[PDB]
Structure formats: structure tokens, C-alpha cells
Amino acid sequence: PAVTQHAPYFKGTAVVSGEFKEISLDDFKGKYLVLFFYPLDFTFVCPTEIIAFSDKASEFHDVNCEVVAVSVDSHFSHLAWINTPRKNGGLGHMNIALLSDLTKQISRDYGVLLEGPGLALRGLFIIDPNGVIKHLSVNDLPVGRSVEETLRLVKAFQFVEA
Amino acid sequence: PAVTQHAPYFKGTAVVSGEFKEISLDDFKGKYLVLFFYPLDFTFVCPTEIIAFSDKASEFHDVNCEVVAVSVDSHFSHLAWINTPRKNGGLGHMNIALLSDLTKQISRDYGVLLEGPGLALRGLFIIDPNGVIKHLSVNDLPVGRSVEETLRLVKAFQFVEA
Amino acid sequence: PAVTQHAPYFKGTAVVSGEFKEISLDDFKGKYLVLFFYPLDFTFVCPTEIIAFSDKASEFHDVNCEVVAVSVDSHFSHLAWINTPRKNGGLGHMNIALLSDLTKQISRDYGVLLEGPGLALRGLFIIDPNGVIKHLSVNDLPVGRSVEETLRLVKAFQFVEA
Amino acid sequence: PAVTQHAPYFKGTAVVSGEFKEISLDDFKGKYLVLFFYPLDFTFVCPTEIIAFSDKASEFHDVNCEVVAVSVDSHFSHLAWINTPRKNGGLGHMNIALLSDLTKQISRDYGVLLEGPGLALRGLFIIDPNGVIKHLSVNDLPVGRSVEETLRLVKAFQFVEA
Amino acid sequence: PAVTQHAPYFKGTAVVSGEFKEISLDDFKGKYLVLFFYPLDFTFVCPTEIIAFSDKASEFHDVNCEVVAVSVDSHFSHLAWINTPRKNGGLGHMNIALLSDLTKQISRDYGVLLEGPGLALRGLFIIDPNGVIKHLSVNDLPVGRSVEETLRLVKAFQFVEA
Amino acid sequence: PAVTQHAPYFKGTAVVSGEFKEISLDDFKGKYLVLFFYPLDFTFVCPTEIIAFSDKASEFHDVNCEVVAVSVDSHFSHLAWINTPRKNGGLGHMNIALLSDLTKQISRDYGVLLEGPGLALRGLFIIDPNGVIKHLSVNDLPVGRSVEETLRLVKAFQFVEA
Amino acid sequence: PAVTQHAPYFKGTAVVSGEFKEISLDDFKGKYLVLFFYPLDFTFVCPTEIIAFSDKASEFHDVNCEVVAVSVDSHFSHLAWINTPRKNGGLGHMNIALLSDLTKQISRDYGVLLEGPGLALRGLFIIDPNGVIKHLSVNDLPVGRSVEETLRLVKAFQFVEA
Amino acid sequence: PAVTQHAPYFKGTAVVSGEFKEISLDDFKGKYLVLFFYPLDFTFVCPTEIIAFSDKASEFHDVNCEVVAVSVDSHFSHLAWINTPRKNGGLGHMNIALLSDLTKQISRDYGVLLEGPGLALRGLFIIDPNGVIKHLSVNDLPVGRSVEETLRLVKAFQFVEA
Amino acid sequence: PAVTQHAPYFKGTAVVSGEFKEISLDDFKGKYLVLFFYPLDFTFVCPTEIIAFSDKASEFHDVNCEVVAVSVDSHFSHLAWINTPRKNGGLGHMNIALLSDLTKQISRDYGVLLEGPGLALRGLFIIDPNGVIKHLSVNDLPVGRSVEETLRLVKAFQFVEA
Amino acid sequence: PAVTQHAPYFKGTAVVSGEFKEISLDDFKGKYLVLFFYPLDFTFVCPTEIIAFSDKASEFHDVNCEVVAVSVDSHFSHLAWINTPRKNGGLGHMNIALLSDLTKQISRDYGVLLEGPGLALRGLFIIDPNGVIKHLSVNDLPVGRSVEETLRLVKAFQFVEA
Amino acid sequence: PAVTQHAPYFKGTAVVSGEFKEISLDDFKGKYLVLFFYPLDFTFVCPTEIIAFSDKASEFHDVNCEVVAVSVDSHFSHLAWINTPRKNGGLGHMNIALLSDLTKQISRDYGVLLEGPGLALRGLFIIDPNGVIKHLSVNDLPVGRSVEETLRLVKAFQFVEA
């Protein structure tokens, strides 16, 4: 999983709307994908960064880019978090797909999986319409990404490709 | 070279002031290090991002953080570029170390070395006082990092460590 | 296989990155080579010493020295062991090549092969850029080498050659 | 090793349950034995045929027949493969003994050892309670046996012996 | 006569239609050959397996495979057995060649000749269009092969060769 | 790389005019080629000898002789040096090709590559129209060649060739 | 002389205290023996390493290990060198036995004798109380062993034997 | 035999004055040596270049530099050539040593020996007071070196060494 | 090379008249050949025996016998010695071929080559019109053959062959 | 058995006077020895040459040289031939020792033994007082040596040795 | 090695002044040589007799005679003994060459080597300018030669040679 190669294939249940949906790398063929990982659902540290993406989500759609968050949690946990109101630490309505990686298999293939505790690092991948990774960020567990910065980067790769 | 392991060792000649100096990973023991890689000296795409770090360099020193840029070029090439005035595409005066990786070994060990052409990708590592990598970015060849963002990240890691 | 002669020739499939690659003694022409034998993959006694080299690998690289580990197992077992997380007794990401000696011919040529059980002793060879063996260790099966000492020795021989 | 003579003696470490156990031809005195060879552990081509036997294993037990698989790998590799879940190319739980032929000696004696690469052909022997070989199959490396057919054959030899 | 080598030369008189005809290994160049041995003509044990091949014969022709039976009998015995109606233990109309090995030489070269009594074991060989043996069965005298299974193997080797 | 065998193949980016161009050994078929290596660009020791060739360049052209310089530097570094005025240590206008050996591969094949530091020795090769090496010079790093002498040598090999 | 066989027999005159004494392998029955070879007395390269052992000698006695140095010189030379003060290149007081191998025999038997010059390589053997060799080092003539590391190795084999 | 390693040892009978003398590389310890090879005595192509050195011989002695010419002829051939007056193709009086390499061993060691015809190429080596090669030339058989250029080069290496 | 076998093949340049000429064993098919070896040209010991053959040369032609001398010298040395007047130790006009064995191969094949110094012993062979050796002499370096006696032997073998 | 090495040892019964006596190479220590082989006793071709030596025997004694003839016959045959009067093809009184080589061993060691028929060729060796062979003749079976010439040769070697 | 034959060849490192120098028998061509052997350096019994010669050394030089002392010790020991002041048993300044026979080969060839202990007997040879031994002395180990007597002998041999 390095910067000029095709991103590893993934399949898995996500929470797409208020519903469970099979999603794979192929569904993003010909689209820009911001795939990003976070440790665990219901953790005090994570929600703000995911919510930020959920907000700006449309900004990405305009520039022809999907955003899917992923963690090692069951898709049931994903739901239960969406169904928690932001007020009490939850996610609320979400505009980005929430992918379950119950199998730990996806986080392993993106080489972001801490095998010790068994949850993913804060990795982010920008994958172009041909399924080529153009960028990756990896942060240690307790530190959020800038959603603005990631948006800038997607646009920047589009610029240089036309 | 991944997020929570010690950064690989590196030694080599850098242009520290107007002068050549042997610098190693050990020199940054008990300090934060922002090690970042760029393809080649004298390329039309590189200078703006390196300059950007040279400027905000003090900001980093304040929060106890060194910045060293690296590329597969000779330390003589590094000097020449420094000695080019910014006006004519150069780098001019530099506040950050410019490390030579002539033997390609450092770029190799940070896993940023495109073996094909023999030059590094735009990788950036944030290394803590204990020599642990806390963050890595990798951009494809033609796209600059945000100096501002990097700095925010360094600070954030100290916050969460106190 | 004695100290001041050219190291016997070898060829064979190694796990070089995540990938199988043919490697021979000739590939290390002009470089220093630390060639080292271990009994078997998936043994409770071996992994720590092999990991130890994989970690300090960059240290060797800087001083123009390659490290390749070898044992009588198939390159398929090598991969499988690399693909085991260190947590559960595996090797994990490896920074050195893992050479397969399926035919037992390499271990035989370096005179480290216990013909009885059919596996190598813990031999280590330091071969210079001209293919001359400058040092050899051989330990009985259950006892590991010091990676630090081996590095000191590689450096030492370079000193004495300039 | 031909059809009406006694099968060559063999001794070696096998993975019997989850455990290592010394097994020899003598342990199968007064029982039918299906001894069968496969190239290497962790190869993409082998697992399906071995699994196939592991499943129908009981069918053989009922008709008083043991099944032991063998290859030139260490008994450690054998275990590691058993401990890989079928999902990811492994063997999973095994109902048959997995014999290690580290010394290549058993494959040599049964005349199935390709000396070139140093691994066995896909040979299968049906040995009766008196240690007499009644049947042998040998397939080139890439082609699996029919477990059903082998079972039919064992039954058939018992029929004709009563 | 082992699996990956060229099958030994053979020449001799066969009963091809109702006629005697010289055949040799060469006549099966660029075709698949199932060459199989049986003990003796007019034995109560043999006819059912031979007949079984005769029936499915065409199935083999379709996949570009010849089937020739062989035994140490004179080609006159062969004919006499063809001319015995199936009803009274004979062979009846035959769709495969019946090769005579009067000199015992063919059975010797394929290593299936019991020198004691002077007849062949129930050996079978699958020889590919290049004259390379890809599979061999040998059964003790009283037990038949499965025609179905042998056909599956022929098909399997063609598969893996395209 | 010895005297009466064909010069090893080489391909690489050169600074031909003011411009970058792909050049290989084949481009010199049917002509005399003086291939010569120098350590690094922007070193205080190197420029006088290169300049020397650059001047007498035409003398060589007259006798049907190309002159290409080479070092381990990027072709960008090359350009930058050309664009430095001779006054301030640079090359200025260049009449000879400047070949980049970024991969260190060319220097490795001509056997002039000090692997330790990772630059070339001051090696010179005279290669005839049929790609046969007729002469080689190798000087330690700090001592220049006489252009005059090299020219005489070229003439000489032609003299003797009819 | 390899790792798991008994160390070859040896008898010879050593400088035990200030006195000559016959010592043989037997005198070390039931003790650990560090038997190590060096080239020649009164060489500018040797003394430091020998001294190093003499100093830590006690450390070895504590863990039940003898240390005897050996070289092809007469025991008279040994004494003479012991009697040279360290100040002027000599050995001074010695805590280890210095064995004379005048006949070159002991070095021949431990397969450390360079027949050309007629002196020994820098070989080191760790022999256990049963006369079994557990470890061997051999360094080319100009490079010293680490005394610490050898000490660590002795301890380690004792650990593993209890 | 390459540029920065010690020149291979050589011994052999030379014609020193009008007299035969045993000379070895050791005789040139702490002096500069220009060792140069030529094909055969009494060839029409060779004499002019050897004479040229014999003339400027003193110039080299001044700058503390020996010159020995060597070819695969007997030292008797050497003498007879010296005893031929320049007038009729000879060498006449000689100010340099003429070394005999009858055994072809010296020419082999310096890697200049055409094994085919059994004679040397026109090689020249500059060896410093420590026995290190600083320069090598190799011309194909029919083309002379410049004695002046070689002289310049000797001085140049002394310059840079002080 | 022993008496009743065919004399080993030989080819090489000889000095036939005043001219160089290729000769081989074949040119002496159906003729008697006296092939004789001597140490070196321009030695004070050799010339008298060679001259002796040159004189009686015709005596040999009459009885249908060629005489060729040989030694490890170049054919240029050969000529130079022919051109030295007998007066001052030379050969003068020669009536026999003088074969060059520059490669030492001929002298090796006839088993007369002293490998130590690299020259031939004083061997002589009488080879008959069928290339069969009928007689051989070998003398230590300082002692001559009798031409008269050798002629008597040639005559004697013809006698006994008619 | 070649010219400058020690003559192979030999022991055996000879007919010394009219009597049998054990003689070995040692008995000729400090004397010159002409050891010469002949095919068989009682052959029509041999006697004249042996007689010839017997006559001039004293001439050899005077110059301190022994002469012993040898052939593969029993020492009894030797006697019987001595006891045949010259008149009827015999040898008559003999002044030289006649050595029996019944075991064919001596002729084997001197490499003159035709293994086919089992008799010696007409070989002659001149061995000096130190046991060094200075000369060897070998003639095919039907042709005699010149005794005069052999004597001249013995004298000649003494001359050159003083 | 006996009285009227040529002294066996010898080569080896000697301590000639305060320096190491290769010396061989050839170096003494045309001079008289007194080669004399002694047991071991640093023995209490030897020094007086060596010193004795060192003193009268010039007496020998006058009558055109060299004196070289030899023992089985390393040339390093030889130095150390020279550098020991006579006062404390040493040799002090030496006026004769001290030859090292580390390989025991020279003492072997001169037949003074006690193989048992591996050291030389007190043998002395007087070799004339042609390399012929004219006198030898051998004393048992503990007894010195009279230097005066040996000098008288050298003179006597010169007398009788003119």
C-alpha cells in the first residue's frame, strides 16, 4: 500500500444511508476516493474528525470525490454510533459511508493495522479514478487530520492531471 | 518505516549553515524532527515548499523541533542551490538542514525511494525525542505539503504527550 | 569456506520485499555482505535475532553493507513467516532479504549444514566487496548473535581497509 | 518402492494433533496406510487436495485405514500451515497426520524426490497391514488426486483380500 | 520410467481393428496416450476394466487422447479374446488398440514386469503429446482402475497446460 | 569492462544542447566515443578538465570522435552547472554531451563506481565504431586527464586501423 | 573442528604464571574453555585484544571458564612478551595461560593455520565441560574480538544448559 | 588490480644494468613505481615507447619514481634486445629495469594478459610508496603511451598528496 | 605422449626460411619428423646442438625426415637469434624450422614443460609418417643430444619397417 | 618418472654374478646408474644390445657408473639365458646385473610397461648419485640403443657437474 | 644438503638492518655465505654465539663473505630480540642478517630440523660463490660454534681456490 501503486482491493458492509450496503474498491472506479481509518467507535478522541468529513462531504462530491471512513468495528456498532446524537458524544446523521472492517483484513492490507491491540492507525489514502494511491497520511492514535487540507490535496491532484 | 516504530538510522553530509556538517539521527535525540524528502535539486516544482519550511523554521525551533530536508543529490548540489538567489529559481539563504543522500540509502530506508528513476518521493516524517515516528505523509512527485499543517501536527503531538 | 578465501557461490530465491526475487553472490559485488544462517522458520528460538538485524538494517546500509538471512526452508515458508505478526511469534515487516536454501546446497557449501537433521547451524559470514570472507561466527542451534557486535566488526574491517 | 514389495521404512516428526509426534512405518502395522506426498507447504496449488483427505479422514478410519500426508518441509512449517485459517489459503484443523521429511530421505526412498529443486512429486501409496505396497499414483507437481477414488481403492483391496 | 521424463520407446504388433498393425510410441506424437498394462488374456479378473475403457473410448478421442492396452500375450491371443463374445468371458468388439508384448520387453521398460511369473502389473501411464509421462498408477494384479477417474486426469493435465 | 571487449550498454538522460535528450551507446555506432566519468558536479577539483574537453571538442569531431562526460548527478544538476558562468566555478557553454547517471548503473557497469561514497572514479574509455573498448584510463578522484593526450590516442587507433 | 563435535586434542607448553607448564585439553575437563588463537607475538596489531581478556579473566573464572590464548610462537617468545611492559607495546602481567604452538600442530588441528605464512588466524572456540565446541569465531589477521561479547556467549550457553 | 587497492605482488628476473637481478614489488616500498607492460621483444611496434621512457628515466628518479618495463619474454631475450643497437631496431643502453615475466604470472595478476596468444596488453600502472595503485592505462597492442603525460601524472599525485 | 601412441597435435608459428610460417603436425603426415625441444633462445648452452642439426639437416631430408626445433620463445626471438651471426653466439643461417611455443602449450602436451620456470626440457621425439611416436629422449637442461645418433635411429626405424 | 625428479624406488632379485642377489635403488646411492629395460629373454631381437653393454661395462665402472638391465622375466629365466652360449642366441658371461621384474611393478613405475602384452618397452634411464634422473630414452620394441652414445652421455653429465 | 652439491634454495623475510627485507640464496650469488642455524630466540643458551658472529661480521665481509643466522622464529621475534639490550640477555645491535624460518621449510631443506620439537639443530654451512657447499657443522642444541674457527675455514677455502 504505497504511493503510485493500485490501492489494495477491499470489500465489506458499510452503513451507507441509514442502511447496510456492500461496498468495494470497484464502486469507486472513475471517482476520487478519500479512504480513511480511525481506531474505534465510541471513543472520546475520534468523533470530531469524522463529523468534520461528514459536514464538508458535499465539497468533495462537487470535485467528484467520495469519502469513506473505516474501522475494525462491526457495522452494527457503526449504526449505533450514527444513532447516538452528537450532543452525547455520538455521530448523528452521516453524509459519508461508514465501512466495517470486522475481519481486520482491510486495515491489514492498507498496512495501518496495529496487530497488538488490533485496531487501525489514523491512516488516510487519496485514491484516483484508476485506483492508484496518490497520497497517504498516517497519524498515531490520538491526533486528528485537517479536513480542509485533505480537500486541498484532492483538488491539487486534479489540477496537475489536467 | 511505519507509525510507532523507531525511525531508521541515517547518517550523511548536510549543508548546515554555509558549511558542510556530518549529521545523524542521534543528533536529534531529545528533540522533535521533521524529516522530509524531495526528489531533486534544481527542479522547477520543488523550491516553493522547501522555502516555506526555511521561513517558518523558527516557529518549529520554538516548539523544540528541527527541520531537515533531504534528497538523493550531492551535498555540492545542495550548496549550489542554496547559492542560487530565489529570484532565478534558487533557494537562497536556508534556515533548515539540507541533507545529502548521495547513496540513495536514506531514501531507501525510509521506503520513499523510487528505484526506477533513483530519486525520492515527497515523504515527510514527524519523529519524536525518543526516535519514534509519530506521523508520515507521502505525496506523489508533483505536489507540495502545507508547512502550516505540519507545524499544527508537531504541536498536537506535544499536547497529547502532556 | 574459510577466512581469506572467496565465499562460495550461491544462487536462490529470496523474499526481497514482499516479493520473491532471485539473488546470487554476484549481486553483492562491490558491497559488504553479512550472510547469516539460522536453523528453521517458525521455531520459538530464532525470530528475535532475525528481527534484531531487520531493525538495525539501516545502520548496515549506511556503512555499505547488505544483510541476508538464510535457512533450509522454502521461500514460501519465508513469506508465511514474514506474514505472521510479531505479536504471535512471527517476523512481520522485514528489511533484510530472506534467502531460501531448499536444496540444502548453500548451507552445505558454507559448511554449516548439520546433515543429520538437515538444517543449518547459526553461522554468520562477513564478505567484503571483492567476495572475500573476513569473518565467520558459528553458534550451536539454541544461541543468538549480537547484531551490535556484527555491525562493529563490519565497520572495523572498513577502517582497516582505509 | 514398487507394487508388491514392502514399503521402505520411514521415521520422522509429524504434526499429529496440534502436537509433534514421532511416527514410523511400524506404527501402521496391521492397518492400511495411505501415505501421500505433496511438494511444499504454503503453495497456492496444494491445499485443496490435502483438505479433501482431512475431511473424508473418518471414512478411511472406518475401513481401518490411516492417512498421512508428507512433504519436504519442517514440522514447524507444517504447524504454521495448520494454524493458518482456510479462509487465507491455510489448512485449518487437520484430521490426518502431517509428516515432515526435512532430510528429504523419505521422499528419496519412495522415489518421488525431484533432486533438482529438492521437493517431492505428488505420489500416493496404499500400503496394507503387512507393509506391502498394493497401489501407487504419481502425478506431476500441479495436479490433485481424487480422494474418493483413493477410498474406493482401499475398500477394493480389502474386498479382494476376503 | 518416472514422472516428468519421456516414456520409454515401444514397438510391437497390436490388434487395431480386427487387424494386426505395427504401432510404436511415435504414432502418438502430438496426442495424449493412455498406455496401460494388464496381466494375461483369458483371466477371469481382467476383462471388466479393459471393456470399461473400450466403451468410454470415444470420450478420450474427443479430448485428443488415445488408449492402448498391453500385456505379455501374443497378438494371436489378443485376437482370440476379442473374438470371444462378452457373454462367455471374452472381450467382444474393442474400441482401443490391444498391444502384444510377447518379448516382455515393453513391460520391462515401463518397470511393470513381474520377472517371477513373467507378466505385467496393472500399470497405467498418461503420456502427453511430447512423449512426457505426466502420471502413473500401478495396482497389484487383482484390482481394477477407474476409467472415469483416468479420463478426469487427462482432462486435468490439458487444463493446466492452457 | 576491459580492453578488447565491447563496451557495456548504456542509456540515460543527457544535457545535449541546452536541452535534455535520451542517449545510448547505439547512438555512437560507427563513431569514436570518448566516454569519461567524473565524481560530482559543483566540486572545486573537476571543472578545469571538463572545460578542457569542451574547448577541443571540435578537434575530436574532425577526427570523427564524440566526447561524452558522465557522473552520478541528476541531469538537472548538470544543467544548473552549465548555467553557472565559468567565472564563479561553473561550466558555462558546453560543446560535449553531459550524461546523467542517476541510477549509478552506468558507473557500475564500467566498473568505475566507488560504492562506498556512491560516485564515479575518473575513468576514461576510448570506444571504437564497432563498440569495442581500445583504451581505458582510471585516475584516483583528485587528478585530471590531459585532453591533448586523449586526442593523440584517438588519432593513433585510427592510424593503426588502415 | 566444527560446532557440536569434540574439540581436537592439544598438548603443549604454556606460560601459566611466570612459569612454563604442560597443559592439555584434559586439564579443562569439567570446565568451560575459551581457546583463542592470534597470529604472532610482538606484532603491533595483537596486544590490545589479548590484554582485554587478561583483564576480564576473573569474570570468566567466576562463571567457571578458563581462557587460554595460543599462537605458533615458542613459549620463550611468549615469556619475553609477558616480560615487556605494556608501555612499550608488550603484554605485561598476564591472567591467562599463553600456549605455545611451536609445531604449528594445534593451529593445524583447529583448522586456523594459514599454511602459507605458517601462522594462525584469529580463531576463537568456546568448549564446554564435556569437550564439545559450542561456538567458533574466526577473524582475518588484522581485527580484534570483543571480550565482552565472548563473555556474554559463555554465560548464554550455561543458561541454556540449565 | 584496480585503482585504490594494493598492486599485486610480483617477483622475477629483470635486466637491471647489463646484469640480471631479482626484483620484487617490495623493492619499490616507499617509492613511486611506473610498472608498464609491452607485448613482445623484437617486435617492430614496441621499441620507440620503451626507449622514450629510458630517455626521460632520470626525470622520474628526480620526482622519486622508478620505471620498470615488463613483458612475457625470457630475461635472455631482454638482454639480447638491449644488446641490439637502436640503429637496427634494438633498444640499446637502458636506464630502466626490464622485467621478465616468463611464467605469464605477472601479466595475469595485473589482468593484462591476453590468454589467447600468451602476451600482455599495453598496460601501465602508477603505484604509490604504500603499494597502492593510483592510475592505470590499458591500450590495445599496436599503440604507444605518452611518457610525458605519465610523468605529469606522477607529479600530479605527489602534489595532491602534499 | 608415450612410445607407440600418436604424437599430440601441435600448431604454431615457426621461422621456416627467413619467413614466419604456420606449421602443424599435419604438415608432416607421411614424413618422418624429428621434433625436439630446447630451453630458451640466447642461452650460452643451446646453440651448438641446434646448429649441429641444421648442418646435417639434408642427411635427414634424404631419408625422408623433417627436423623442427621448438622452445617457449616468441617467433620474433627466434628470428632475432637466426639473425645473430654464429661468431657472437647466434644461430646464423638455419636449415630446419624453428617453432615458437609462446603459449607453452606444445611443451605442455609433449610433457617436457618445466612448469616452475616455464620452459622446456631437452626432449626429442621421432614421429613416423603415421604420426606415431617411435622414440623419445629427454635430457636435463644443460646437456646436448647427438645429431649423428638421432639420424641412425631414424634410419633404423625405416629399416625395421621394410 | 621424468627428467629432474628422483627415480622411483625399485627392489628385486637380480643375477649379479652367477648368483641371485637382492638389489634396490639404494645400492646405487652415490653412483651413476644406467637402468635399462628390454622386452623379454630368449627373443631373437634383444641379445646384441645387452651384450654390447656387458662388454663396455668396465668403461662405465671407470667413470663411476653401474649398469643394470631389466625385464619382466623371472630371475630363473635370466640365469638360463646367461647360461646359454652366445653361439646359440644366448647371453653368455655377463658383466652387468640382470634384474628380474616378475611383478611387472618396476616397469610400471618407470612407465615403460606395455600393459597389453605385459612386457617393457626399450627404456633407458641415467640416474645420478643423488637418485635424480638426468636422461631417458624410450625406443619401440624392435630397435636397439647405442652403448657408445649412452656412455658419452654419462660422461657429459659428470663434466657439467664439475 | 651435502658437501659438494649446491646448497638448497631458500627465501624468507630477514631482519637486515633494523628493517625487514626479503632475502634468498640468489642474493649471495658470487659471495661466500656462512648460513648457520640456531634453535630458538630468547633462549638462555644461544645469544653468545650469534653475538660472536655479529662482532666478527666485518672480518667476514673483508674476505668477501656474508653471514646470515637462521631459526624457526618469526621475523617479529627476531626484531624483539635485536631490540633487547645485551645487558638483559638480548642481542642488541646486529651486523648480520637474521632470517626467519617460520614455515620450518629452510631448516627442513638443510636437514637440520628436529621434527619432534619443531626447531633447528646448530648447523652451519659454508657456501661458495657458485652456490656449492664446501663445509658443514652440526652440533647438538646446547653447544656453540667457534666464530674464529669458521673464519679460518672460509679463508682456507679461498686460499685453495687460487
Curated annotation (Swiss-Prot), chains A, B, C, D, E, F, G, H, I, J, K:
One of its GO terms (cellular component) is plasma membrane. Predominantly expressed in adrenal cortex. Also detected in liver, renal cortex and medulla, and adrenal medulla (at protein level). Phosphorylated by LRRK2; phosphorylation reduces perodixase activity. The enzyme can be inactivated by further oxidation of the cysteine sulfenic acid (C(P)-SOH) to sulphinic acid (C(P)-SO2H) and sulphonic acid (C(P)-SO3H) instead of its condensation to a disulfide bond. GO terms for biological process: cell redox homeostasis; cellular response to reactive oxygen species; hydrogen peroxide catabolic process; maternal placenta development; mitochondrion organization; myeloid cell differentiation; negative regulation of apoptotic process; positive regulation of cell population proliferation. It is an enzyme of class 1 (oxidoreductase). One of its GO terms (molecular function) is identical protein binding. Keywords: Acetylation, Antioxidant, Cytoplasm, Disulfide bond, Endosome, Lipoprotein, Mitochondrion, Oxidoreductase, Palmitate, Peroxidase, Phosphoprotein, Redox-active center, Transit peptide. The modification N6-succinyllysine is found at K21, K29. The active site is at C46. The modification N6-acetyllysine is found at K29. It catalyses: a hydroperoxide + [thioredoxin]-dithiol = an alcohol + [thioredoxin]-disulfide + H2O. Its EC number is 1.11.1.24. Residues 1-159 form the Thioredoxin domain. The modification Phosphothreonine is found at T84. Belongs to the peroxiredoxin family. AhpC/Prx1 subfamily. Thiol-specific peroxidase that catalyzes the reduction of hydrogen peroxide and organic hydroperoxides to water and alcohols, respectively. Plays a role in cell protection against oxidative stress by detoxifying peroxides. Acts synergistically with MAP3K13 to regulate the activation of NF-kappa-B in the cytosol. Required for the maintenance of physical strength. Homodimer; disulfide-linked, upon oxidation. 6 homodimers assemble to form a ring-like dodecamer. Interacts with NEK6. Interacts with LRRK2. Interacts with MAP3K13. Interacts with RPS6KC1 (via PX domain). The active site is a conserved redox-active cysteine residue, the peroxidatic cysteine (C(P)), which makes the nucleophilic attack on the peroxide substrate. The peroxide oxidizes the C(P)-SH to cysteine sulfenic acid (C(P)-SOH), which then reacts with another cysteine residue, the resolving cysteine (C(R)), to form a disulfide bridge. The disulfide is subsequently reduced by an appropriate electron donor to complete the catalytic cycle. In this typical 2-Cys peroxiredoxin, C(R) is provided by the other dimeric subunit to form an intersubunit disulfide. This is Thioredoxin-dependent peroxide reductase, mitochondrial. It comes from Bos taurus.
